[PDB]
Design a protein around this ligand. Structure first.
Ligand SMILES: NC(=O)C1=CN([C@@H]2O[C@H](COP(=O)(O)OP(=O)(O)OC[C@H]3O[C@@H](n4cnc5c(N)ncnc54)[C@H](OP(=O)(O)O)[C@@H]3O)[C@@H](O)[C@H]2O)C=CC1
Ligand SMILES: NC(=O)C1=CN([C@@H]2O[C@H](COP(=O)(O)OP(=O)(O)OC[C@H]3O[C@@H](n4cnc5c(N)ncnc54)[C@H](OP(=O)(O)O)[C@@H]3O)[C@@H](O)[C@H]2O)C=CC1
Ligand code: NA
Ligand code: NA
Lengths: 319, 319
């Protein structure tokens, strides 16, 4: 009948998460938001008025006029699930702490934030295990393109041999647009307007966003507990880019060891990844029992990413 | 720990279903096959030896030397699930009868066969409802491309506004190859070699395979109970085909009524469907909360279709 959530972060993605929940509730499970924050304020309570919170955030830039000190402020209400739409920390410790607090409080977790899982996979899964809880992370790789839900429920009979995809938006948008002769400033301005740039855009340009995604992918698919120290990645540099250059993230096994690598590649015309449009993301998974499957979208933005977060909420409602 | 199945039909798709199950069991839930048939013979028992059955079918063309009269022959063993890999009947009545028997016997159903659902959706769902059982049908539209599992578990928050795809293989392969100047015989020979042609290949050429898929799609997505009488379809004709012609199946709402239409269309260069290779299938779903999602594969054959069937078996194991 109803799932109670706490939402941390109400920016590009988190405010859209509220919008989707509100639209969903109006069709009528029910998703009841019992706690919500931004960096400075919060709301907490049994019957929180989501459209009113959306309106107040849009108009004033704040969730409320009630100062937020940390996650502890939100643990006064019984909830089933914590949703993390906060920006990446440098080391993942803040996120680990949040998820651990959630798990110990009887909650599962849904996250769009990549830093906790990219840095602290081991400690996060240990706390999940010890508390008998779950974490889902659809939005952490290729925002709005179905990926982990596909791997979890569409190719159950298979071993995955390889993953290759365009999964980090801003770096790819930058490379493609600079190949057309645009300045970095202009492209970055467009990425911000679209809502796809990281809260720290240097994370995009140095390839760190892709790197984080590659950790989550390799650990998910091959069962490893790698960190950023174990993957290879590259950022944008001063080269003149070609029209067919893309920042491709690959996960596969080399000499019995899983590898995660993000690199700039000049793609062949017939590569599936070249079918992906300027505003989209996508990937290809090679499997041993379900063939080679290709998945992409047309426009991958914070709204679509929010839809991935809400899909995760609904998948966890059935546990 | 274990799911017990009965498999009806051990042709291109069904023998691969056994192969996948056997490979799966060797990695070690367990899928235990307690009944299996082809048109003339069957095996039934607690500890059936799948690799031995595969070998006997491959070598001799028969499952066993024990005459099969109908589904009743297989109901002596307790099972959780019936799998239908039999060919399409003209009217769906045989399939309805089979599923009804299964449901009443305490079993769920997984099917690759499109005719029951395309003709008898209402009666089949009624019997499922009345007996509190389920039916899954991943393999019935676009063999090995994940479709219903995507709609069920990857875009839960959304309303689907439209579906468009290349989902009927043989007719598309024929059109594309004849556009290259090949004779019908040569192309049909290749389709049979690949294992993608229907047991009655006229079902492919007159567009009936696509039509059946369109019924299943419109009923699944929009909640209707249409039959073949309610959809529009076309077959191959004597025209000279263009390089960009494809038989596209669309499902959408026109003036408040859902519509299902399969038709030959000359696609634009930038259409996602033009990214689909000669041996593949794929589609695009427009959604209101998860964007527009594209899904395809590289080689859609009876092995990949079998993998879709086994995914359905594994999804039902968790009920
Ligand atoms: N943009 C995209 O399409 C994609 C985003 N993601 C991930 O989603 C997450 C959110 O992205 P996005 O919404 O664009 O980011 P934003 O910067 O737009 O929003 C971040 C939100 O969290 C708040 N916040 C910042 N620091 C803290 C803090 N330490 N504790 C609590 N709240 C905090 C912000 O406060 P305030 O409103 O006061 O600024 C804001 O509400 C990121 O981790 C990102 O990597 C994943 C895939 C796609
Ligand atoms: N080929 C493909 O990739 C696709 C197939 N499908 C569907 O899968 C189903 C099977 O296709 P495919 O394996 O190619 O077909 P085949 O003709 O190769 O195999 C059919 C199997 O069923 C047996 N059979 C025929 N009639 C009956 C009967 N009335 N009762 C019990 N068994 C019977 C056949 O017997 P015997 O071995 O004695 O001939 C054979 O074992 C079809 O409905 C098809 O539409 C769906 C998507 C993709
Ligand atoms: Na995703
Ligand atoms: Na399918």
């Amino acid at each position: 009948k109803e799932i109670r959530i706490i939402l941390m972060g109400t920016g590009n993605v988190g405010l859209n998460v509220l919008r989707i929940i509100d639209a969903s509730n109006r069709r009528r499970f029910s998703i009841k938001v019992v706690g919500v924050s931004d960096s400075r304020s919060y709301a907490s309570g049994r019957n929180l008025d989501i459209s009113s919170i959306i309106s107040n955030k849009e108009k004033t830039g704040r969730i409320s006029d009630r100062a937020f000190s940390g996650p502890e402020d939100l643990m006064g209400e019984a909830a089933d699930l914590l949703v993390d739409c906060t920006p990446a920390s440098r080391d993942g410790v803040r996120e680990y702490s949040l998820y651990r607090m959630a798990f110990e409080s009887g909650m599962n977790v849904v996250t769009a934030n990549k830093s906790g899982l990219a840095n602290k996979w081991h400690d996060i899964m240990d706390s999940a295990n010890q508390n008998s809880k779950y974490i889902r992370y659809e939005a952490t790789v290729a925002g709005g393109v179905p990926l982990f839900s596909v791997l979890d429920y569409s190719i159950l009979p298979s071993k995955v041999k390889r993953f290759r995809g365009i999964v980090s938006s801003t770096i790819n948008y930058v490379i493609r647009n600079m190949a057309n002769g645009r300045s970095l400033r202009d492209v970055v301005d467009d990425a911000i307007k679209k809502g796809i740039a990281e809260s720290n855009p240097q994370d995009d340009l140095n390839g760190l966003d892709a790197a984080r995604k590659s950790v989550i992918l390799v650990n998910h698919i091959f069962g490893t507990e790698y960190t950023l120290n174990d993957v290879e990645y590259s950022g944008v540099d001063e080269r003149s880019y070609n029209a067919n250059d893309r920042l491709v993230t690959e996960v596969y096994v080399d000499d019995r060891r899983p590898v995660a690598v993000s690199r700039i590649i000049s793609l062949n015309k017939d590569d599936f990844l070249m079918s992906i449009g300027m505003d989209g993301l996508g990937y290809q998974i090679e499997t041993d029992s379900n063939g080679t499957v290709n998945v992409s979208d047309i426009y991958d933005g914070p709204y679509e990413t929010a839809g991935a977060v809400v899909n995760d909420i609904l998948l966890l409602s059935k546990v």
